Structure formats: C-alpha cells, structure tokens
Swiss-Prot record, chains A, B:
Domain GST C-terminal, residue spans: 80-198
Domain GST N-terminal as annotated: residue spans: 1-78
Regulation: Prostaglandin PGD2 synthesis is stimulated by calcium and magnesium ions. One calcium or magnesium ion is bound between the subunits of the homodimer. The interactions with the protein are for the most part mediated via water molecules. Magnesium increases the affinity for glutathione, while calcium has no effect on the affinity for glutathione.
This protein's name: Hematopoietic prostaglandin D synthase
Function noted in UniProt: Bifunctional enzyme which catalyzes both the conversion of PGH2 to PGD2, a prostaglandin involved in smooth muscle contraction/relaxation and a potent inhibitor of platelet aggregation, and the conjugation of glutathione with a wide range of aryl halides and organic isothiocyanates. Also exhibits low glutathione-peroxidase activity towards cumene hydroperoxide.
InterPro entries in alphabetical order: Glutathione-S-Trfase_C-like, Glutathione-S-Trfase_C_sf, Glutathione_S-Trfase_N, GST_C, GST_superfamily, Thioredoxin-like_sf
Entry-linked Pfam families: GST_C_3, GST_N
MF-aspect GO terms: calcium ion binding; glutathione transferase activity; magnesium ion binding; prostaglandin-D synthase activity; protein homodimerization activity
Amino acid sequence: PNYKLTYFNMRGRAEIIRYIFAYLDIQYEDHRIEQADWPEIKSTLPFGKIPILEVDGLTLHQSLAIARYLTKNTDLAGNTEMEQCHVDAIVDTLDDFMSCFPWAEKKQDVKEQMFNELLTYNAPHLMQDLDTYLGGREWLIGNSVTWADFYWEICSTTLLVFKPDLLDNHPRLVTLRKKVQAIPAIANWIKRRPQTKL
Amino acid sequence: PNYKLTYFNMRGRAEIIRYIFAYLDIQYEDHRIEQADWPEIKSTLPFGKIPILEVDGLTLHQSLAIARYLTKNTDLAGNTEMEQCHVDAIVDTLDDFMSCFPWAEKKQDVKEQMFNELLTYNAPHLMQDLDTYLGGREWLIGNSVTWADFYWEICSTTLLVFKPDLLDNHPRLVTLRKKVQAIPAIANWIKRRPQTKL
Ligand SMILES: COC(=O)Nc1nc2ccc(C(=O)c3cccs3)cc2[nH]1
Ligand SMILES: N[C@@H](CCC(=O)N[C@@H](CS)C(=O)NCC(=O)O)C(=O)O
Ligand SMILES: [Mg+2]
C-alpha cells in the first residue's frame, strides 16, 4: 500500500520505523514537518502526538505499536512467541530509560541536572545490565537480528550525544552497534538520512 | 504451563497481567513480595525490575511485553493486524501518561505539585482524546473486549485515587469502566484481590 510517515526532522521516535522500512526495502513518504506548522498538524492527530503512519489513509499511531505492526511476520520479529516477548521486553526496557529524559524541559538548568543525574548514575547501570544480558551472543535475541537490535543502535546513538564515553567499558555493545550499522540497507539509510542532533 | 508472577503487594504494573489470567481462567502463583525481600530478588533479575513472570522455569519481564505475550492468539489481542496495532497504541498511550508521574519521588512537596499539575493541565486533554476515540462504540477496539479495555480500567482506577473528578465530563468513559468491571471473571478478581492503595 501507500505509506506516509509524519514526524519532525529528527531521528527521535520515528527512527525505529525508518530503519524497519529501510531493512524491508519498502518505499514510503518520509514526511518531515516544519515546526511552525506543528500547532495545526497536532489538532488532526488522534492523541496530539507524532509519529503517525498513514497506510492508504488509514492512520496508525505510537511509534512502537507501529514498529511491531511493520515487523509482524518478518525476520525482524523474533523467531517464536516467547522470543517475540523478549524482543518487546528489551525494546520497552530501552524505551523506559529514554522516556525518563525531560526532552521537552523548559528551565535549561533543571533539564541539565535531570540529564546529568540520569547519565551519571542511571545510564552506566543500564549499560552494564545490557552487556550482561547480551553476554557472548551475536544479537540481543535469538540467533539473528531483530528490531530490538535496531532499537539498541538507535537509543544508544542519542545517548552517546550526551555521554560520549558511555560504552568505553562495553566493547561488546559497541560491536552490536556496528553490526546493526553494517547491515547494507541500514548502512545506506544512515548515509542518506538528514543529519540531526536527536 | 506453570506460571509464577512476582511483584509487590500492589495493583501497579502487575495488575494488567492479573486481569488477563482472571479473564482467561488460568491458574498462576500470585507471588507478592514485601520490601524486606526486594533487594535480594532484584540482584538476580537481568534488569532489576518487576513484574516478572516465570513460565515453565523461564523468566519474562516487562509488564506490557508479558501481557501481549499472554493474549497472543486469544480473543483479547484484537482481530486484524491493524486492530492489534490499535490495541498496542492505546495501551502505549495510557502507559506513557502513567509514566509521567514521579511515583518514586521522595520529596513529597515536589511530588504532590507534579501530580497535581499533571492531573489538572494534562489528564483532561487525554480523557477528551480517549472519549473522542471511543465515540459511541462499546469497546475501545473492534466490537469485543480487548486488553486495552482492561488497561483503561486499571489506569483510570489509579488516576481516580488522585483526581476523583477525573471522569465527571466523560460518562462514556465511566460506562466503559463499568462494562469491564461487570465481566464476571474480572468482577470476581476485583472482589477478591488484596485491597492496596495502588
Ligand atoms: C509507594 O508506592 C509507589 O508510589 N510506587 C509505585 N510504583 C508504581 C508502579 C505503577 C503504578 C501504576 O499504577 C501504573 C503504571 C502504569 C500503569 S498502572 C503505580 C505505582 N506506584
Ligand atoms: N515498564 C516496566 C516498569 C518496571 C518497574 O520500574 N517496576 C518498578 C515497580 S512498578 C520496580 O521494579 N522498581 C523497583 C526497583 O527499581 O528497584 C514494566 O511495566 O514492567
Ligand atoms: Mg513504553
């Protein structure tokens, strides 16, 4: 069908969907809105958030709902129902952490202490948990790449913006990042995508 | 299989899983820990968070991952692939909002202010969106109950504790909570569960 993704000009919460479409070699309109048009566009949305994915003018919302929809019956899904549960669980564990950040914070000091707090104390613990979880396997779940690996590469890319040294002690999480980045369709997208901070 | 759910003595993030087992008429061990015992259990969990659900000796984590797993191939999941997406989206929409609250905040003057801002400035927008979303239909998605309906009733029960007037302008939302609460297996669980604030 006809796919149109609407988001800001950032990776943010649309990037997992952009990776999936890249990987499945599915063409879509990557619509990136002007911030000035935001109040308008927002009053057409089911819940006032983006991203939304229009599928033949049937609207889907909630980036991970959409991601799960798109990967259903693909090799990105997890190879069994329980492995699908582990893929969902890892994704939510990463999302829970990312959602802790006051991304829409006003007081640029209060923001920067919340950030410093989360990055100084919370992120290292998560990195260590993820490194133990991964251990010596190739991918986070099962014997092949799933969208949870994509989500790790996406989340950690943003986290490295604010904390460059995040993985100095975790070469195996770096390896996994570079393996996702090396999958040809993902590599092409990374090279083609707009360069944005977030 | 043999199921063991581990959580605090609280509805909280385990409640959605408890509703699903009640509705599907599935026996499980409802293991409620007290605080004394939490640090020692924590250190054995790969992500240090509960709920967990042990299934024939394998551990699953992340409450919505687990709920989605348990409902796969039941009437609770949604019928079409698109309806499954909408179920996941509504669940995520409710959960994202439940996530803004500083549940852990120990300085209660800052806690109480935050709760109040959220409940006054934010919540009513979401209620309005959910009510418009529901329209005149019996259930959120499709024409039969799904776990999104259960998560609505659960999330709103907790919200109503802090903002008792939350649904005063939303009779269609109150009707939906009452329908979920009238489903006999759910009714019986609500009657019998331990009474806890949250
Ligand atoms: C003294 O206990 C707490 O404040 N902690 C606490 N932890 C909690 C975790 C979850 C919830 C809760 O009601 C939901 C969150 C998402 C859906 S229901 C409420 C909670 N309250
Ligand atoms: N998104 C997760 C939240 C898990 C979570 O943060 N659980 C809390 C209590 S609801 C917890 O284990 N906190 C205790 C701790 O972190 O030590 C889920 O739904 O399972
Ligand atoms: Mg979430």
